[PDB]
Design a protein around this ligand. Structure first.
Ligand SMILES: *[C@H](O)[C@H](C[C@@H]1CCNC1=O)NC(=O)[C@H](CC(C)C)NC(=O)OCc1ccccc1
Ligand SMILES: *[C@H](O)[C@H](C[C@@H]1CCNC1=O)NC(=O)[C@H](CC(C)C)NC(=O)OCc1ccccc1
Lengths: 302, 302
């Protein structure tokens, strides 16, 4: 038993991380087949970053201006292109460690593992949820751009995130591997708002199910509610409204515990209205919303 | 910026995980050079586990009774020995993926990454602290024994933990890689107590420093205290007593923030006596004690 925020084993991705330098700017690139993907602001000087014209900036760059290092091994760049907010550098050597992989655009409320990297070398791994407002709450310093987020399904790595920027609020934003930002963000160093940060209701319920599965049951009560009644409470508390699809997604957990979803909703409502009274649930004194139902099932079944 | 519980990249360890079967019992083994390490209760039947005589049980076992699989590849076992609570199976092939490594016995209050595994295949990675009472708060199911805990220093893997058992309280216990349990535990399926679970004071202070570094400063106050005054508060709250060595360990963080350690102690005291008033620190509504000072520095400096 026990329930912990858990990342995927990162070895398959470690073997794809490279260092990309252009001028005095260094960040990380992702090397798959004979293509290296990285954030296009690798071409900016610190001055260019306030209002970059990326087309003009790129035009002064040639292949030999992109220095790509895999370990101590330098790679030969034979082509370059800009796709949205990422550069694709064509190299002359296919990565021998390329895993089976795909590029995917995750949906808000889904989770993925971040392999935080500096100078092309992995630093650490941790789980993140793509929040409803298309931000993530990570740990990123200067030089971490190009670090990627991923999921693993048996042997296939699904890359879903590349890191680009930190907002004034301290939350983190980035793109998919086609270089389209998640959310209303642009890669320029100007103040940018993410808007209200709502709570992922179906994930809170999943984590309450995980809590019950793991012996934490004090918050259960004799009440039930309706979807429309509950959702009127979610409104007040900036929770996402619950839908039958969410109910259906919770089915396996509902059946595996014998607690109707709307009975669990009634417990959540009382927690939202009455607080936790200084108690904890799965070691936390707040309601946790960065576990998906799949996260809870995968971890409660190995 | 940002502060997250972060595990080491696990690739070096993924390449060492194998499956070990004896009879109808399967768990994980660690394959380094030509030796495979695993928990000795792989030889028990479910009945033997209530009161096993491991010497007698082992004697009925020969090399060919230990089935060791690396991926789809079966390994040939040429020798077996029992060292404390672990088996060492000698195989005829050195692991070609053996990293540079050492075996270390960690101290209570230190942290390490767990690579949770089933049937010899990595499932997920997460950070754990060895608590003062020699338990860890993990996520382990049937079949997870032999999963290991480790730290990485540039290229050297320091293995410090192998998983064996879950206590009635739901916390987790295990051995070092010489097979000596951390704590007063035995590998038998009988009720076993860990004793009082005290809080790692120096780690709470490190995390308060991490909070200040990351903009969370509301808990700072105009007061200071003394080591003996503070420790009288730690007593009431089952905190470990603070020592000058702890003060010295905190020096870099104290100097990097300009907050004297005893000023930070005074803040902790008020938090302990007055609670958090419904506020949060680094996204938490409790005081977190599973980050070491080194953890905070490593993560706030890449
Ligand atoms: C890429 O390595 C970097 C990651 C930032 C640095 C601190 N935390 C992060 O996530 N991205 C940038 O520096 C980015 C560049 C633009 C051209 C997109 N600018 C940015 O994030 O500005 C905000 C900021 C910069 C430095 C420290 C704190 C916030
Ligand atoms: C090894 O795979 C296993 C790990 C337990 C299973 C559930 N969570 C864990 O950490 N260890 C054992 O099953 C262990 C065997 C003894 C001979 C040491 N017994 C054990 O931990 O008993 C407590 C327990 C068993 C099953 C479910 C929950 C608790």
């Amino acid at each position: 038993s026990g329930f912990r925020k858990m990342a995927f084993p990162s070895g398959k991705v470690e073997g794809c991380m490279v260092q990309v330098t252009c001028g005095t700017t260094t960040l990380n690139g992702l090397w798959l087949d004979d293509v290296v993907y990285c954030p296009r602001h690798v071409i900016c000087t610190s001055e260019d970053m306030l209002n970059p014209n990326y087309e003009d900036l790129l035009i002064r760059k040639s292949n030999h201006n992109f220095l790509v290092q895999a370990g101590n091994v330098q790679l030969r760049v034979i082509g370059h292109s800009m796709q949205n907010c990422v550069l694709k550098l064509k190299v002359d050597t296919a990565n021998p460690k390329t895993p089976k992989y795909k590029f995917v655009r995750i949906q808000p409320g889904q989770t993925f593992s971040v392999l935080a990297c500096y100078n092309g070398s992995p630093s650490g791994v941790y789980q993140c949820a793509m929040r409803p407002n298309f931000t993530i709450k990570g740990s990123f310093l200067n030089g971490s751009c190009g670090s990627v987020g991923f999921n693993i399904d048996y042997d296939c790595v699904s890359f879903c995130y590349m890191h680009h920027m930190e907002l004034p609020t301290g939350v983190h934003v980035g793109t998919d591997l086609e270089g389209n930002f998640y959310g209303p963000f642009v890669d320029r160093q100007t103040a940018q708002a993410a808007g209200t940060d709502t709570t992922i209701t179906v994930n809170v319920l999943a984590w309450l199910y995980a809590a019950v599965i793991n012996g934490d049951r004090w918050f259960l009560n004799r009440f039930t509610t309706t979807l429309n009644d509950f959702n009127l409470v979610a409104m007040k508390y900036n929770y996402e409204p619950l839908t039958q699809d969410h109910v259906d997604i919770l089915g396996p957990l509902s059946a595996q515990t014998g607690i109707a979803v709307l009975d669990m909703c009634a417990s959540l409502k009382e927690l939202l209205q009455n607080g936790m009274n200084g108690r904890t649930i799965l070691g936390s004194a707040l309601l946790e919303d960065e576990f998906t139902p799949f996260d809870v099932v995968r971890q409660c079944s190995g």
